[PDB]
Amino acid sequence: SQYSIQQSLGNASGVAVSPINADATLSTGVALNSSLWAGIGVFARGKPFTVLAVTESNYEDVLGEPLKPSSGSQFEPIRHVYEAIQQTSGYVVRAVPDDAKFPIIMFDESGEPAYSALPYGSEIELDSGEAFAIYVDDGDPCISPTRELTIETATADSAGNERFLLKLTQTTSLGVVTTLETHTVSLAEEAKDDMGRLCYLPTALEARSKYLRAVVNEELISTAKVTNKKSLAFTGGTNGDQSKISTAAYLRAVKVLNNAPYMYTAVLGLGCYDNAAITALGKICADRLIDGFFDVKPTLTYAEALPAVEDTGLLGTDYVSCSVYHYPFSCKDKWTQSRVVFGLSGVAYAAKARGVKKNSDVGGWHYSPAGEERAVIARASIQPLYPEDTPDEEAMVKGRLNKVSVGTSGQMIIDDALTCCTQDNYLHFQHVPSLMNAISRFFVQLARQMKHSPDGITAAGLTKGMTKLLDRFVASGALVAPRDPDADGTEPYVLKVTQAEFDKWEVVWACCPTGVARRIQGVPLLIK
Amino acid sequence: LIDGFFDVKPTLTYAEALPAVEDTGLLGTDYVSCSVYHYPFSCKDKWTQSRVVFGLSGVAYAAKARGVKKNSDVGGWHYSPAGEERAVIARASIQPLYPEDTPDEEAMVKGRLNKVSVGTSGQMIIDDALTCCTQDNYLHFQHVPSLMNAISRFFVQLARQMKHSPDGITAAGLTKGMTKLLDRFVASGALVAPRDPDADGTEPYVLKVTQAEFDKWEVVWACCPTGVARRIQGVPLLIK
Amino acid sequence: SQYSIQQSLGNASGVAVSPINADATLSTGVALNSSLWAGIGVFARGKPFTVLAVTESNYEDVLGEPLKPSSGSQFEPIRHVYEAIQQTSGYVVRAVPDDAKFPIIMFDESGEPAYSALPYGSEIELDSGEAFAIYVDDGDPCISPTRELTIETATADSAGNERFLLKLTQTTSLGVVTTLETHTVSLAEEAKDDMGRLCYLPTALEARSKYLRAVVNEELISTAKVTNKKSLAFTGGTNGDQSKISTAAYLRAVKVLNNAPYMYTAVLGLGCYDNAAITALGKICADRLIDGFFDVKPTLTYAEALPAVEDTGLLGTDYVSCSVYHYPFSCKDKWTQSRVVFGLSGVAYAAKARGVKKNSDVGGWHYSPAGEERAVIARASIQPLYPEDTPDEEAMVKGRLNKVSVGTSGQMIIDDALTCCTQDNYLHFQHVPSLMNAISRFFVQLARQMKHSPDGITAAGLTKGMTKLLDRFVASGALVAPRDPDADGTEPYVLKVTQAEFDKWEVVWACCPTGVARRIQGVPLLIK
Amino acid sequence: APRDPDADGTEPYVLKVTQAEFDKWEVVWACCPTGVARRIQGVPLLIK
Amino acid sequence: APRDPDADGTEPYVLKVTQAEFDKWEVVWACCPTGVARRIQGVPLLIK
């Protein structure tokens, strides 16, 4: 009609405005100064084989209350999570044993409920007389505190379908009974609640409730009717034995973590001392270009620690960013007040996060996760496990094993930044692979955004983006002038964007990383 | 001398998609400007609100039109109909038809079948610009035939207008018109300097208008087309 | 009509444009920097005598769960696959014993099912009363976990044909029951499903399902009717004894691998210690111009290792690219945690892939598959089998047998790059045949593309393509100036394209390959 | 002024009065007419 | 004013009105828009 604006204006009188160009102002939002940690573990509460999200204010309830050291070896990952959350949120994957079962309540046409239990990861088959089944997907085995489900009659909708109110409440062993969640659902395929949302039972429970799930029998859903049932009881749930777990479960969990559609920059090996799982997590590091902080069993003597590092499998050239730790010391637990021993992955990641939070523009990735200002270990009544033994500094450095020590003021610290690389070059220090991987991730983002453009735009865009990013890093201070300013010029970074064929745009950037200060030597002199 | 965007049945598995492209018949050397697509995904319809599946020809043409509307003087014909800023697919609740299968990237590229993917931000996009040409030269990319066909159509118009004139007018007119058009294209940016400025000079286009007999006015123009950026590789280095 | 454009314009007024020439811009797409590995083996799950495809994310399910060392000698190929996948995907061929049988369910007109089992590789004959038969082509013997098939009535199509829903679900021994696949199929020859695809049972199952296959009886298919059968059960499947396998099965498997229509550049001898099979794989190398990494039984003493290499049959002049390894050491398994011994083919190929992934333009084929930065062996608790014995370095080098050693830092490495060539020239090193074969494969591609052209185009095209490729290699660094720059010039490569008769275009290229650094000698001196 | 002030000078009009024979006075005038504004196109841009 | 006053001048807007053919009056204007303040960060320091 009128007031309309065209854009082509071909061989005819008129006026047209072209769409806004906005191609010389293409930025890239990656937010390099952000770090998240991902790990697998064994816990008390949570949905098995599904990626979770833990923050500083919900881990206690999403992952359940902390376990007990006297139960077995399952008390490690919760403490690792507690020590690692201190800085940033993260993603965890819970792995359960084979015989873990969750409760199920199945109804019928008359409405008399029945109870059962089913192993995790299995769907439900409905018997002839079963109308619909409700089960719990929070992962809790419903043994302590118990959980009760109540059905109440409610007013029908405008159309005429009967909607009933569902109320699930938890009861502790002491006697405290608090409501937990409530809903208004119906078996009609199209009925709506008061607020207008869909109130069909399966989709309603799946969408608006994070505790329950339900299934229905299509044949019997037409004539199904629900009575008034008060104070039901889930039963049969069982977490099983968590002391022992087959390597298949750990492999499945790490595969799920691999396929998780999230972003994280640390693959913390949360209290999982299994060679296959550690190798898989190293594969995750190598694939995603991130950092890993694994740790050997912290109950081995200094003699057996060295062969265990070779056993764990990352010693080679493929995994150049994964560090291995060892902390053979005892400590007093924060919660249960007992003598427990656990690893150092959480503290290593806390050191790395403290380092990465120093710079604000691009984030400081060039700070090593060691020292006395960024890697202090906070425990209670540290009592060495083997006071009669002594470290093997030279053997440890040759075997790529970071070691703890006692810094100034008497607090234990981490005093090495060595990776799993065996080659003796710049790559075996910790900070260099992290910085290079940050640059590579930014490049992948930029090139993915800039793919499929003509060469005229592509060359200028790539050059501008890379020059800006590397200038930001140099101003931050992660790159310095080359050691020998005679052969390889005098610039911190050298950039070269070239065309190899019709479409082979090749970018080569060479950077000079900063030098850590690991060995300091003083030579006093006297002047005649 | 135009462009075609055809598409195979979007209910075939990735295994049967490849022989169907050979079946459909354009695989050869005569049809160098026709693209073939394949979109095995489900979607929620806009009008009836149901589960339907259909093709990708409309979205491919929308991408081509978005590309051609960039330049205003001569229109940008050198923009490939793929990427994350010109070929996004707008649907509702895209649910893959065969989640258990996987594409065959190398086989697809050898068989000249454009494939969909998931770009940044999570919207499905078209991520190829391959035509039905089997020969491995500059002609199997999508933008080159379109640009050459635009130039050829303009030439046909000009020569049809300028037919039946004496040679004195004809030579000057042909040279002026072609020089102006190719200069417009170079200023637009669809032609760049040759890859090797040692043998084939250093000009984007070379024009030659000649007389072969009493009336055989022959025009030969050679152009260097732009280079798409399909594969990008980064090689980090460390300096001692 | 109008707007049409002609191309001939012969002796008539008009205007025409010739089709685009595009002959001086002919490239060649071969992607030299890509390597895939092909091998035969014995596994638990998979379709027998059919080429497969294994990547880093599906081998566990396509090839089934890993076997058990206590079962016998069938535990080798899975571990070899696991060690070789780390770098690149590949193709495998499963060979089964003679008495392996797969289950079959045959129906009838009334619908009462019957069960049976048939040996692999055999078609099915239908009895008079049998309407149609369904069987499993995944290769699994359906013993653990069990597999159940369910038939459900569904709504007829628009035409009127009756379509039923097929649901196959797996049940583990513990009790976990998960659905596996579902379809909507019918016995009508033309009925269509909701989405519009063909729903005839045989073609539908063959095309859209990778687990099941079916056959029908033409005579009884017209009057055939299907009832509602719930929770059927496959039975009779048996993988047989995989400890012993006749050489005929291995020969058939390698023949299938030969006729496979795929591309691969390594013919890894996955845990198959049979002379006939090894000779056939050497034939595959000599035919396709690729590389092979075979390995003798890793339980022979150093005295018997040497005659076994002559026994295995590749010692000659035809197989100049196949290497033979020997790894007489024990190790601790990753999965079952036991004492097992297996070969070195996987690690050898991992070294070769690490070498080939260095250069990005053409790929580095000139890196030998040995050293301390590219061939480290990652195992757990390596304990030598025969600590009292000693290697025979001179005898091993004369007999063309690569030997393991202990490099720096204490990790075992591969310390030789000798092939099976007996002649003492440049051909017995490992990197030279690989580089020459890469060049030859590129030449075959180029000449196949450029065949049947006139000489004017042909000479220029061949010269340009070969000059560009060899310049790319020289810039990569795989060719250096000749050792003696007095007789054979001073250029890395010499090219000569000539015509011998009307059509005998002959291309001769001579290259000077790089020199590996195998023996390093230092001679200190003192100056008066 | 002419559109391209490189070949056809830079004057709006060129006049030439000549004699061809005893009486064939020939006047040739070449003018550059103004350009109407029929199609107007605007191309907005953004500056980094 | 533009963010980088080294390449793209120092004026907020650049306007160019040109003639392409007899009647193709083409107007190209490039402007530098203001910067919203969405993320604000403070970095305290101590001076020796």
Q: Do the Cβ atoms of A289 and A437 come closer than 8 Å?
A: yes
First and final CA of chain C: distance in angstroms?
A: 99
3-state secondary structure of A86: coil
Sort B86 into a burial class: Cβ within 10 Å, 0-12 / 13-18 / 19+.
buried
Report chain D residues whose CB lies below 8 A from the CB of A18.
Answer: 41-44
Report chain C residues whose CB lies below 8 A from the CB of A506.
Answer: 360-361
Report chain E residues whose CB lies below 8 A from the CB of D41.
Answer: 24-27
Q: Kindly report the CA angle at B225 between B222 and B230, in degrees rounded to 5?
A: 155
Length of chain C counted residue by residue: 528
Contacts of D29 (CB under 8 A, 6+ apart): D13, D14, D15, D16
Q: CA C211 to CA C204: how far, in whole Å?
A: 12
Q: CA A371 to CA A416: how far, in whole Å?
A: 8
Question: What is the CA B72 to chain-centroid distance, rounded?
Answer: 19
Q: CA C53 to CA C62: how far, in whole Å?
A: 9
Q: CA C258 to CA C264: how far, in whole Å?
A: 11
Q: Kindly report the CA angle at A408 between A405 and A413, in degrees rounded to 5?
A: 35
Q: CA C409 to CA A424: how far, in whole Å?
A: 10
Q: How far is CA A6 from CA A363, A482, B43, B75, in A?
A: 46, 57, 31, 15
The total of other beta-carbon atoms located within 10 Å of residue A264's CB is 22
Token readout for C492 is 């890395």
**Dihedral sign, Cα of residue A183, residue A186, residue A190, residue A191:** negative
Nearest to A378 by CA among A411, A414, A348: A411
Whose tokens are 């200002």? That residue is A373
Q: How far is CA C258 from CA C253, C453, C473, in A?
A: 9, 31, 30
**Dihedral sign, Cα of residue B97, residue B99, residue B100, residue B105:** positive
Q: CA B103 to CA B115: how far, in whole Å?
A: 8
Q: CA B214 to CA A285: how far, in whole Å?
A: 74
**Dihedral sign, Cα of residue A235, residue A239, residue A241, residue A245:** positive
Q: At C322, give phi and psi (nearest 5°).
A: -105, 125
- The whole-angstrom distance between D34's CA and the closest CA on chain E is 8
Q: CA A375 to CA A391: how far, in whole Å?
A: 20
Chains touching A by CB (3 or more pairs below 8 Å): B, C, D
Helices (H), C289-429: 302-312, 345-356, 393-398
Q: How far is CA C509 from CA A407, C476, C498, C513, in A?
A: 66, 18, 11, 12
Q: CA A14 to CA B2: how far, in whole Å?
A: 27
Sort A176 into a burial class: Cβ within 10 Å, 0-12 / 13-18 / 19+.
exposed
Q: CA C127 to CA C134: how far, in whole Å?
A: 14
Alpha-carbon torsion, ordered B197, B199, B205, B208, to 10 deg: 160
First and final CA of chain D: distance in angstroms?
A: 37
**Dihedral sign, Cα of residue B53, residue B54, residue B60, residue B62:** negative
User: What is the DSSP code string of A148-201?
Assistant: EEEEEE----SS---EEEEEEEEE-SSS-EEEEEEEEEESSSS-B-TTS-B-BH
How does strand D39-46 pair with strand A14-17? Answer: parallel
Q: Do the Cβ atoms of B219 and A494 come closer than 8 Å?
A: no
Helices (H), A222-358: 247-259, 275-288, 302-311, 345-356
> Are there at least 3 beta-carbon pairs closer than 8 Å between C and D?
no
Nearest to C311 by CA among C427, C399, C426, C437: C399
Token readout for A155 is 């007013």
Strands (E), C365-409: 383-384, 404-406
Q: CA A312 to CA C380: how far, in whole Å?
A: 7
Q: CA B30 to CA B8: how far, in whole Å?
A: 19
Q: CA C158 to CA C160: how far, in whole Å?
A: 5
Q: Do the Cβ atoms of C112 and C225 come closer than 8 Å?
A: no
Sort A473 into a burial class: Cβ within 10 Å, 0-12 / 13-18 / 19+.
buried
User: What is the DSSP code string of A391-428?
Assistant: --HHHHHHTT---EEE-GGG-EEE---B-SB-SSSGGG
**Is any Cβ of chain E less than 8 angstroms from the Cβ of D45?**
yes
Q: CA C179 to CA C420: how far, in whole Å?
A: 51
Q: CA B198 to CA C55: how far, in whole Å?
A: 45
Q: Do the Cβ atoms of A196 and A205 come closer than 8 Å?
A: no
Sort A106 into a burial class: Cβ within 10 Å, 0-12 / 13-18 / 19+.
buried
Q: CA C313 to CA C277: how far, in whole Å?
A: 10
Nearest to B146 by CA among B82, B200, B196, B195: B82
Chains touching B by CB (3 or more pairs below 8 Å): A, C, E
User: What is the DSSP code string of chain B?
Assistant: ---EEEE--TTS-HHHHHHHHHHHS--BSS--SEEEE---EEEE-SSS-SEE---SHHHHHHHHHHHHTS-SSS---SS-S-SSSS-B---SS-EES-TT----HHHHHHTT---EEE-GGG-EEE---B-SB-SSSGGGBSHHHHHHHHHHHHHHHHHHHHTT--HHHHHHHHHHHHHHHHHHHHHHTSB---S-TTTS-S-SEEEEEE--STT--EEEEEE-B--B----EEEEEE--
Sort B97 into a burial class: Cβ within 10 Å, 0-12 / 13-18 / 19+.
middle
Q: At C193, give phi and psi (nearest 5°).
A: -80, -170
**Which method was used?**
cryo-EM
Q: CA D13 to CA D31: how far, in whole Å?
A: 4
> What is the helix (H) or strand (E) element at residue A105, kind and residue range?
strand A101-108
Question: What is the CA D23 to chain-centroid distance, rounded?
Answer: 30
Nearest to B56 by CA among B75, B35, B86: B35
**Amino acid making up residue C223:** T
**Dihedral sign, Cα of residue A318, residue A320, residue A322, residue A323:** positive
* Cβ–Cβ gap C176/A283 under 8 Å: no
Contacts of E47 (CB under 8 A, 6+ apart): none
Nearest to D47 among E2, E19, E25 (CB): E2
Q: At A94, give phi and psi (nearest 5°).
A: -90, 135
Q: CA C187 to CA C225: how far, in whole Å?
A: 9
> What is the helix (H) or strand (E) element at residue A119, kind and residue range?
strand A114-119
- The whole-angstrom distance between B80's CA and the closest CA on chain A is 7
Q: CA A20 to CA E31: how far, in whole Å?
A: 11
> What is the helix (H) or strand (E) element at residue C216, kind and residue range?
strand C212-216
3-state secondary structure of C441: helix
3-state secondary structure of A429: strand
Q: Do the Cβ atoms of C277 and C53 come closer than 8 Å?
A: no
**Is any Cβ of chain B less than 8 angstroms from the Cβ of C195?**
yes
Whose tokens are 């009008």? That residue is B47
Rg from Cα positions in chain B: 22
Nearest to C81 by CA among C334, C300, C421: C334
Nearest to A284 by CA among C86, C412, C242: C86
**Amino acid making up residue C416:** D
**Is any Cβ of chain A less than 8 angstroms from the Cβ of B145?**
no
- Closest residue in D to E29 (Cα) is D44
User: For B212-238, what is the HEC assignment?
Assistant: CCCCCCEEEEEECECCECCCCEEEEEE
3-state secondary structure of C178: strand
Bridge partners of C322, per DSSP, are: C292
Nearest to B54 by CA among C196, C45, A518: C196
**Dihedral sign, Cα of residue C308, residue C314, residue C320, residue C322:** negative
Nearest to B21 by CA among B33, B32, B9, B31: B9
Nearest to C450 by CA among C505, C488, C406: C505
**Amino acid making up residue A138:** D
**Amino acid making up residue A222:** S
Q: How far is CA A287 from CA A309, A438, C79, C143, in A?
A: 21, 14, 21, 36
Resolution in A: 3.5
Q: CA A225 to CA A237: how far, in whole Å?
A: 27
Q: Do the Cβ atoms of A379 and A332 come closer than 8 Å?
A: yes
Nearest to B33 by CA among B69, B66, B77, B70: B77
Helix pair angle (A76-85, A345-356), 10° resolution: 10
Q: CA A105 to CA C341: how far, in whole Å?
A: 51
Nearest to C174 among A98, A500, A501 (CB): A98
- The whole-angstrom distance between A11's CA and the closest CA on chain D is 8
In the A/B pair of chains, how many CB contacts fall below 8 A?
A: 114
Contacts of C504 (CB under 8 A, 6+ apart): none
First and final CA of chain B: distance in angstroms?
A: 57
**Dihedral sign, Cα of residue B196, residue B200, residue B203, residue B207:** negative
Contacts of B143 (CB under 8 A, 6+ apart): A454, B77, B78, B79, B80, B129, B225, B226, B228
Whose tokens are 């083997």? That residue is A386
Q: Do the Cβ atoms of A39 and A59 come closer than 8 Å?
A: no
Q: Do the Cβ atoms of A71 and A241 come closer than 8 Å?
A: no
The total of other beta-carbon atoms located within 10 Å of residue B18's CB is 19
Token readout for A203 is 């989709």
3-state secondary structure of C280: helix
In the B/E pair of chains, how many CB contacts fall below 8 A?
A: 3
Q: CA C218 to CA C200: how far, in whole Å?
A: 13
* Cβ–Cβ gap D39/E25 under 8 Å: yes
**Is any Cβ of chain E less than 8 angstroms from the Cβ of D48?**
yes
- The whole-angstrom distance between E19's CA and the closest CA on chain D is 9
Token readout for A174 is 């002491």
Q: CA A412 to CA A325: how far, in whole Å?
A: 14
The most distant pair of C-alpha atoms in chain C lies apart, rounded to whole Å, by 109
The total of other beta-carbon atoms located within 10 Å of residue A16's CB is 17
* Cβ–Cβ gap E2/D45 under 8 Å: no
Q: CA A67 to CA C380: how far, in whole Å?
A: 32
Token readout for C518 is 């195998």
Q: CA A218 to CA C110: how far, in whole Å?
A: 26
Question: What is the CA C162 to chain-centroid distance, rounded?
Answer: 43
Length of chain D counted residue by residue: 48
Q: CA C356 to CA C370: how far, in whole Å?
A: 13
**Is any Cβ of chain D less than 8 angstroms from the Cβ of A9?**
yes
Q: How far is CA A301 from CA A296, A304, A340, C379, in A?
A: 11, 5, 17, 21
Q: Do the Cβ atoms of C106 and C14 come closer than 8 Å?
A: no
Q: Do the Cβ atoms of A44 and A67 come closer than 8 Å?
A: yes
Token readout for A478 is 């992660």
Q: How far is CA B203 from CA A189, B178, B179, B193, B206, in A?
A: 70, 15, 13, 6, 7
Helix, strand and coil content of chain A, in percent to the nearest 5, comes to 25, 20, 55
- Burial readout A290-327 (b: 16 or more C-beta within 10 A, e: otherwise): bbbbbbbebebebeebbebbbbbbbbbbbbbbbbbbbb
Q: CA A208 to CA A214: how far, in whole Å?
A: 12
Peptide bond just before A145 cis, omega within 30 deg: yes
* Cβ–Cβ gap C378/A315 under 8 Å: yes
